[PDB]
Structures are given as structure tokens and as C-alpha cells.
Amino acid sequence: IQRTPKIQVYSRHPAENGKSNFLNCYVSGFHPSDIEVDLLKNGERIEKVEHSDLSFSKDWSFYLLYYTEFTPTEKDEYACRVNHVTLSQPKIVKWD
Amino acid sequence: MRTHSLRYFRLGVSDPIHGVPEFISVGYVDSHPITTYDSVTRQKEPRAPWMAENLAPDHWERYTQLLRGWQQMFKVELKRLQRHYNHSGSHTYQRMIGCELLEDGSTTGFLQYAYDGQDFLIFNKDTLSWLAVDNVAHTIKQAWEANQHELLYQKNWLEEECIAWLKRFLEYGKDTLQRTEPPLVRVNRKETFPGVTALFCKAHGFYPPEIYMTWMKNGEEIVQEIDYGDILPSGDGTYQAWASIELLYSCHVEHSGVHMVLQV
Amino acid sequence: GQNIDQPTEMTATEGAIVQINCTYQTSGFNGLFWYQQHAGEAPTFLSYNVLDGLEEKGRFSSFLSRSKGYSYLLLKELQMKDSASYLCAVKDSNYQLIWGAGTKLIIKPDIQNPDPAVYQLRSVCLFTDFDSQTNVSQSKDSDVYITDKCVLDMRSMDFKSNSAVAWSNDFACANAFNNSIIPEDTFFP
Amino acid sequence: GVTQTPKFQVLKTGQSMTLQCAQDMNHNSMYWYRQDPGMGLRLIYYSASEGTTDKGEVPNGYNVSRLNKREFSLRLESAAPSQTSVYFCASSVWTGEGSGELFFGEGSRLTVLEDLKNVFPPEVAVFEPSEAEISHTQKATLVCLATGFYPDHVELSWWVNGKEVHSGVCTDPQPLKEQPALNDSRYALSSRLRVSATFWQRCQVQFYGLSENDEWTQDRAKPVTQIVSAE
Ligand SMILES: *C/C=N/c1c(NC[C@H](O)[C@H](O)[C@H](O)CO)[nH]c(=O)[nH]c1=O
Structure with missing residues (x-):
């Protein structure tokens, strides 16, 4: 039994254009443990991205938090790109 | 005092694909990582600054050696489990041990194993027995239950040792672990699909992550469909969560002994 | 881990009972062990205790009280073969074994027919067949050598006897064991 | 189960020496202790499993080698009279498990003379x-x-x-x-x-x-x- 990751993309604080914030991508509930996460700005990979270590849940699945400091603009598009053994191709999850 | 827990996990992977370590063991106090060890570093390292400054190198040096042995034991146990099932390729083996100090002062302790992310063996410290999920788990259970003294050592670890460590670590990390950051809560009203009005009760900036959010209609519980957002980490040590309904309504939020009502 | 205290030595009579205490003051507790170590031999595991109670293994029982940080090793129907050292060890919070300095156990035999006598051998003076309550004192001279009290067993005749040896380079069997508190009725041929 | 050598050894100060210890019980953990009158056994070095070793209570003047799963040898580089003692090799199934007892070797008596x-x-x-x-x-x-x-x-x-x-x-x-x-x-x-x-x-x-x-x-x-x- 393999479990595909749950992928959630959200800001640290309620978002307001022009005000500095942090973009979060929480990847959870997956099994096995090998995963690849990237944060994107207009389809391109953000290089200065911080992350927690692989974490363990009591249901034997894993979770991680990926985040980067950003200033949201009406024209800038943000996403979280995730790859796991359950996925044929990496999944691009847009920030709402 | 609020409820607190101490847990340690072990993760073993056979035939690891390039990058994934063969063995990882992580310690937690509530939702905070406190220690880590893996087959690549072969070192026990703190994952919290208050762990680093309160535990001397003697602790870190002693447990590195024990974890080196626990790593080897996990390697062999997973080979034996794969032989029992007739399994080839990469398989996973997991352990979770821990205890809880409840608000009323009572305690819980648990010790569990998983094979391929599914329940495999569950310890019952009150009867000193192992609960097996299938015949392969039953074979292992018979072996573990043959050693009565290891069963008593395990009961003593869960009920006494684990609790004494938890209380020690609660004192070290008190400025983070025993603090309280009240939630910022707002209710947002919006007409969605024509004729439908959605109410969103959103909370953020709270610590600890334990929160209660509920929607009430005319003072009594709602019987309609409520959507719930996950309690998500914000990245700054605080959390966020939400609850929504459709259409006198009020959102009720309880967090660390404080009740909050938001009347629409 | 910090301190483990057990008596240095204990003396009891054959067929009787002895209790060896062990008190520990440690940082955490993961079990308490008892090991038996015969003279000039390797220690051998006797018992393990981690929860409160008493466990029996033949004539040997081990007790533990976690709250009092105390254990005892009890031996019943004391036999001569029980003369050995008894080691108490505790595993602390870090699974480090803390050892106690050991308890030497001396078993006084059951002298049914005491016949105290000092003989001369072809020289050496042998003080034999005395009662277990007799304590042999050491020499004070540079040339006189007195040995410690020894118990020998003739299993075929179910006979046990106490003995001490003396020798020097002037030296008489009458003055040999004069340092000790010799029984009044000691035979001097 | 645990075989250690030599039973007895006379050494001159400064001399080097190696004590051997093998076990065929498939034990993972191995230990070197010295026994001295009036005190508890003191751990010199230990090996929690094959591929790792660490200092015990009295490691100075000694070194160890976990050669394989079965063997744990103790070396005296430059013998000192303070190293006059009874040496014991011991093994246990694992370390970091409360109930597992030690299995002792027969002992090694070492006398270091000027x-x-x-x-x-x-x-x-x-x-x-x-x-x-x-x-x-x-x-x-x-x-x-x-x-x-x-x-x-x-x-x-x-x-x-x-x-x-x-x-x-x-x-x-x-x-x-x-x-x-x-x-x-x-x-x-x-x-x-x-x-x-x-x-x-x-x-x-x-x-x-x-x-x-x-x-x-x-x-x-x-x-x-x-x-x-x-x-
Ligand atoms: C400092 C890291 N400790 C640790 C532990 N320790 C808890 C117990 O001593 C251990 O689980 C025993 O095996 C319980 O019988 N456990 C762990 O899995 N990983 C660690 O880093």
C-alpha cells in the first residue's frame, strides 16, 4: 500500500500585495518516504527555499514543510512542485 | 499543566534508492523535533536549541553508540521480515515508542511496529503481550513474548523512564513548550454559487496547535455540513486552521482555557 | 548513574539463610542485576529485576523496591559452594551498567564433633578440627607464616573440617597459634 | 561461549600487549572490564555493535579493535604498573535493552613489572x-x-x-x-x-x-x- 502526498500551498499570514510574507507548502500523508519538493515563481524554481526534515506521523506516513520569504504581487504566480513514487510525473500545485 | 507527549520513531529502508538513508530515528516532544540520527551521519544530534544547551556531550556520545546498534538491529529485523513474507526489493520497517503526561496527571505509553507503513505489532503493556496483525506478526510475537524480562523492562521504560525524560525535556523547553499564543480569529462572509452564502471562520497565529472551532446556529450545534481545514504550521512556530458552513450563526473558538465567540 | 552500595563482606552458617542488600542512587533506572563470582573465576548472571516484586530461582530469590531504590539477594539452605562474591549492578537512564564493589560471602560449616588440635608435619604446624566460631589471627614475626582458616569436605564420609597452617625458621607448635584465641581443650601431642 | 586469551601474562614496563576475545553466540555488543580489589568492575572500552567502539570509564593506556562481530581485542601500547589487574571480556546480545545480561570470559591476569x-x-x-x-x-x-x-x-x-x-x-x-x-x-x-x-x-x-x-x-x-x- 502506497499513499500519494496531500499538498497544501498557503501564506504564513493573510496575504496583502506589496507586504512581505512567507509562502508555505505542506506535503503530508505520504508513504514511502522518498519525495522531491520545489517552490516555483512563474514556473521557475526559487533557489532560497527552507525546509523542515522528514517528519513522522503516528499512522506511519510522513510530512514536510517547504517555505520561502516573498512579497506577493497581482502578476506573480506561485506553485509547489512535488514528485513521489505514486506520481507518474511531478505535480504542480498552484497557490490559490 | 496542558497535555504533553514524548515519542521516538525509527525508520528502516531495505535496498534504499539513491538519496534515502537506510535508517532514520527522530525524537519529538509534542509536535517539536528534539533529536535526530541517521545511517549517513551516524551521529545523534539535537533538533531543538534547548536540547543542545541542557544535555552534555556525554548524552549525545552515549546514544550515538546505542543508535548505531539499534540501526543494525533494524537492518536484521527487516531482512528476517522480508524472508518471512518472501519479499524482494525495497520494503520499510517502522517503530514508534512514546508516552503522554495528561492534564489530570495520569499517563499513557505505547510501543508499535509497522511493516510497509501498515500496523504489524502493537504492545499491550497492561497484559505484557504483543498484538499481531497476520501469521508473520504472530511468528515474531511468539519470539518476543518468550523473553518475560524484556517485556517488564519495556513496561518500566514506558511507565517510568519515558515520563521522567518527558518532565526533564518540558523543563528545558518551557519557554517554547509551555507558552501560549492566542489565535487571531475572523469570520468572512461571501455569496458563492448563485443563492449560496458561505461563512468562513479562520484562525491563525496560535500556539499550541490544539484548538477547538465549531459553528453554532441560534446558540445550539449545527446539523448541516461543516468543512474543516487542517491545523497547518505557519513556519514561525504558530498554526492556522478554519471551519466553514453555508446558510443567527456564530463561530466558537476555544484555545488554552479561553473561549471566543464571533457572532455573524 | 552515581552510587551503588552493598556490604563488603557477610558471614552466615551452612543450612541457614542470608540476605545481601544493595541500595542504588542512579540517574534513571533500567533494571538491577545480581552476578555470582567464585574465587578466581568469571562472574555469572544470577537474576534481573526491573519491576517491584520477588522472583525465585532454585534456592536463590531476588527482590526489588523501585521507590526505596533497594534490592536484596536471598539464599536459602546455605551450602559451602555458595562461598563466592555477589555483585550488584544497575542500568541507568543511558543503559550504562553501574557496578557495586561486591559482597564476599563466607559460609561457616556445621562442625558436629569439634576436636581442636595442633599437629606437626614432616616443618609445618597444622591447627585442625576446631569449631567455626574460632577466628585464626595472623602472625607478628618476620619468619613465622600463618595461613587463613580453610574448610575441606570429605564427601564420601559427609565430614567437614576447619584448618590453618603455620611455618618458620626456635619455632614450636605450642607457640605457633598463640596470636589467635585458641579453644581451652586444644590437643597438643 | 566467550573465549579470552591469555589467562596469565608478565610484562615489563613500556612493553606492548594484546588480549584476545572471541564469542560464537552471535552477540552484537562486546566489553573490556578490569577488576581491581575494593571497587566495582570498570569498563575500559565497549563495542555496542560491529563497526563501532567507544571509551568506557578507564580508557587511558588502552585501545581496542572490533575486528568482526565475533572478536574484540584489547591492546596495552606501553604497559604501566597501574595496569596490573584482572581483565574480563564480556558480551551481550545487544546494548540499549534493559534485561540483556553479560556473558563473561574466564579472565586475564596481568602483572606489569619495572x-x-x-x-x-x-x-x-x-x-x-x-x-x-x-x-x-x-x-x-x-x-x-x-x-x-x-x-x-x-x-x-x-x-x-x-x-x-x-x-x-x-x-x-x-x-x-x-x-x-x-x-x-x-x-x-x-x-x-x-x-x-x-x-x-x-x-x-x-x-x-x-x-x-x-x-x-x-x-x-x-x-x-x-x-x-x-x-
Ligand atoms: C536520545 C535518543 N533516544 C532514542 C530512543 N530512546 C528511547 C528508548 O530508550 C528506546 O526506544 C528503547 O529502545 C526503548 O526500549 N529511541 C529511539 O528510537 N531513538 C532515539 O533516538
Whole structure:
């Protein structure tokens, strides 16, 4: 039994254009443990991205938090790109 | 005092694909990582600054050696489990041990194993027995239950040792672990699909992550469909969560002994 | 881990009972062990205790009280073969074994027919067949050598006897064991 | 289960030495302890599993090698007199498990001397039972004396009509010091053998001393490992 990751993309604080914030991508509930996460700005990979270590849940699945400091603009598009053994191709999850 | 827990996990992977370590063991106090060890570093390292400054190198040096042995034991146990099932390729083996100090002062302790992310063996410290999920788990259970003294050592670890460590670590990390950051809560009203009005009760900036959010209609519980957002980490040590309904309504939020009502 | 205290030595009579205490003051507790170590031999595991109670293994029982940080090793129907050292060890919070300095156990035999006598051998003076309550004192001279009290067993005749040896380079069997508190009725041929 | 070597060893200060320890019980954890009078066993080094080792309580002057799962050797690089002791190798199934007991090796007695000039085998003499003991108790005690040996590395045993005996035998647990005020005093060991007057109507001492490898520049015969007996 393999479990595909749950992928959630959200800001640290309620978002307001022009005000500095942090973009979060929480990847959870997956099994096995090998995963690849990237944060994107207009389809391109953000290089200065911080992350927690692989974490363990009591249901034997894993979770991680990926985040980067950003200033949201009406024209800038943000996403979280995730790859796991359950996925044929990496999944691009847009920030709402 | 609020409820607190101490847990340690072990993760073993056979035939690891390039990058994934063969063995990882992580310690937690509530939702905070406190220690880590893996087959690549072969070192026990703190994952919290208050762990680093309160535990001397003697602790870190002693447990590195024990974890080196626990790593080897996990390697062999997973080979034996794969032989029992007739399994080839990469398989996973997991352990979770821990205890809880409840608000009323009572305690819980648990010790569990998983094979391929599914329940495999569950310890019952009150009867000193192992609960097996299938015949392969039953074979292992018979072996573990043959050693009565290891069963008593395990009961003593869960009920006494684990609790004494938890209380020690609660004192070290008190400025983070025993603090309280009240939630910022707002209710947002919006007409969605024509004729439908959605109410969103959103909370953020709270610590600890334990929160209660509920929607009430005319003072009594709602019987309609409520959507719930996950309690998500914000990245700054605080959390966020939400609850929504459709259409006198009020959102009720309880967090660390404080009740909050938001009347629409 | 910090301190483990057990008596240095204990003396009891054959067929009787002895209790060896062990008190520990440690940082955490993961079990308490008892090991038996015969003279000039390797220690051998006797018992393990981690929860409160008493466990029996033949004539040997081990007790533990976690709250009092105390254990005892009890031996019943004391036999001569029980003369050995008894080691108490505790595993602390870090699974480090803390050892106690050991308890030497001396078993006084059951002298049914005491016949105290000092003989001369072809020289050496042998003080034999005395009662277990007799304590042999050491020499004070540079040339006189007195040995410690020894118990020998003739299993075929179910006979046990106490003995001490003396020798020097002037030296008489009458003055040999004069340092000790010799029984009044000691035979001097 | 646990096999350690050597049983006895005489070393000159500065000399190097290696104690061997093997176990065929598939144990993962191995330990080196020293036993000294009046104190608890002190861990020198330990190996929690194959591929790792760490310092115990008294690691200075020693080093270890976990060669494989079965073997854990202890090395004395430059022997010092403070290293005079009884060395024990032990093994357990694992470490970091409360109930697992230790399985001990037979022990290694090590004596470190500034020089080997005071090393002597014993003089072994048997004393015939007195006529008085035979006519009073109808029992006969044969006494054996091993005298002037150094260091204290001896195993006294009795042998009657070609076979070793254990019944009616008592050997002193610790030998006495012939020159008690002297730091390098030589030793004396006694033992008794009791038989019936009808049975009376040979003692042997195994000495552990020098080896073929040791240099001897003295007039007296090299004090090597030997057996000294009395009939
Ligand atoms: C400092 C890290 N400790 C640790 C532990 N320790 C808890 C117990 O001593 C251990 O689970 C025993 O095996 C319980 O019988 N456990 C762990 O899995 N990983 C660690 O880093």
C-alpha cells in the first residue's frame, strides 16, 4: 500500500500585495518516504527555499514543510512542485 | 499543566534508492523535533536549541553508540521480515515508542511496529503481550513474548523512564513548550454559487496547535455540513486552521482555557 | 548513574539463610542485576529485576523496591559452594551498567564433633578440627607464616573440617597459634 | 561461549600487549572490564555493535579493535604498573535493552613489572601427616607448600594415584606475602589433602612466568612458565 502526498500551498499570514510574507507548502500523508519538493515563481524554481526534515506521523506516513520569504504581487504566480513514487510525473500545485 | 507527549520513531529502508538513508530515528516532544540520527551521519544530534544547551556531550556520545546498534538491529529485523513474507526489493520497517503526561496527571505509553507503513505489532503493556496483525506478526510475537524480562523492562521504560525524560525535556523547553499564543480569529462572509452564502471562520497565529472551532446556529450545534481545514504550521512556530458552513450563526473558538465567540 | 552500595563482606552458617542488600542512587533506572563470582573465576548472571516484586530461582530469590531504590539477594539452605562474591549492578537512564564493589560471602560449616588440635608435619604446624566460631589471627614475626582458616569436605564420609597452617625458621607448635584465641581443650601431642 | 586469551601474562614496563576475545553466540555488543580489589568492575572500552567502539570509564593506556562481530581485542601500547589487574571480556546480545545480561570470559591476569629480575617459580614441598592425627582422629592430612614465587600466578592441584582429586582438598584463596613490608614481596601458598588412616597406610603447582620471547641475563635458570611438584 502506497499513499500519494496531500499538498497544501498557503501564506504564513493573510496575504496583502506589496507586504512581505512567507509562502508555505505542506506535503503530508505520504508513504514511502522518498519525495522531491520545489517552490516555483512563474514556473521557475526559487533557489532560497527552507525546509523542515522528514517528519513522522503516528499512522506511519510522513510530512514536510517547504517555505520561502516573498512579497506577493497581482502578476506573480506561485506553485509547489512535488514528485513521489505514486506520481507518474511531478505535480504542480498552484497557490490559490 | 496542558497535555504533553514524548515519542521516538525509527525508520528502516531495505535496498534504499539513491538519496534515502537506510535508517532514520527522530525524537519529538509534542509536535517539536528534539533529536535526530541517521545511517549517513551516524551521529545523534539535537533538533531543538534547548536540547543542545541542557544535555552534555556525554548524552549525545552515549546514544550515538546505542543508535548505531539499534540501526543494525533494524537492518536484521527487516531482512528476517522480508524472508518471512518472501519479499524482494525495497520494503520499510517502522517503530514508534512514546508516552503522554495528561492534564489530570495520569499517563499513557505505547510501543508499535509497522511493516510497509501498515500496523504489524502493537504492545499491550497492561497484559505484557504483543498484538499481531497476520501469521508473520504472530511468528515474531511468539519470539518476543518468550523473553518475560524484556517485556517488564519495556513496561518500566514506558511507565517510568519515558515520563521522567518527558518532565526533564518540558523543563528545558518551557519557554517554547509551555507558552501560549492566542489565535487571531475572523469570520468572512461571501455569496458563492448563485443563492449560496458561505461563512468562513479562520484562525491563525496560535500556539499550541490544539484548538477547538465549531459553528453554532441560534446558540445550539449545527446539523448541516461543516468543512474543516487542517491545523497547518505557519513556519514561525504558530498554526492556522478554519471551519466553514453555508446558510443567527456564530463561530466558537476555544484555545488554552479561553473561549471566543464571533457572532455573524 | 552515581552510587551503588552493598556490604563488603557477610558471614552466615551452612543450612541457614542470608540476605545481601544493595541500595542504588542512579540517574534513571533500567533494571538491577545480581552476578555470582567464585574465587578466581568469571562472574555469572544470577537474576534481573526491573519491576517491584520477588522472583525465585532454585534456592536463590531476588527482590526489588523501585521507590526505596533497594534490592536484596536471598539464599536459602546455605551450602559451602555458595562461598563466592555477589555483585550488584544497575542500568541507568543511558543503559550504562553501574557496578557495586561486591559482597564476599563466607559460609561457616556445621562442625558436629569439634576436636581442636595442633599437629606437626614432616616443618609445618597444622591447627585442625576446631569449631567455626574460632577466628585464626595472623602472625607478628618476620619468619613465622600463618595461613587463613580453610574448610575441606570429605564427601564420601559427609565430614567437614576447619584448618590453618603455620611455618618458620626456635619455632614450636605450642607457640605457633598463640596470636589467635585458641579453644581451652586444644590437643597438643 | 566467550573465549579470552591469555589467562596469565608478565610484562615489563613500556612493553606492548594484546588480549584476545572471541564469542560464537552471535552477540552484537562486546566489553573490556578490569577488576581491581575494593571497587566495582570498570569498563575500559565497549563495542555496542560491529563497526563501532567507544571509551568506557578507564580508557587511558588502552585501545581496542572490533575486528568482526565475533572478536574484540584489547591492546596495552606501553604497559604501566597501574595496569596490573584482572581483565574480563564480556558480551551481550545487544546494548540499549534493559534485561540483556553479560556473558563473561574466564579472565586475564596481568602483572606489569619495572624489570623481570624478581620473577621466581615456587619451591614445592609435601608434608607427611603426623602419627598423632592418625591415632586421634583416624584421618590423615597431607599439607603442600608452594614458597618464594613471584608474581602471584599459580594454580595448585592435588593428584592421587595418577588422578586429580577435589574431595578433602582446601587451598588458600589468596597467597601470603613472605616479606610483607617489601613492595616486591615473594609469595607462599598452602593447601591440604585429607584422607583416612587406612588410605595413607602428589602435589603440583603450575607457575605462570616468562616466555621464550623474554630476555634473560642472569646466572639462575630463566623463571619460565612451568610445573613444580612434590611426591
Ligand atoms: C536520545 C535518543 N533516544 C532514542 C530512543 N530512546 C528511547 C528508548 O530508550 C528506546 O526506544 C528503547 O529502545 C526503548 O526500549 N529511541 C529511539 O528510537 N531513538 C532515539 O533516538
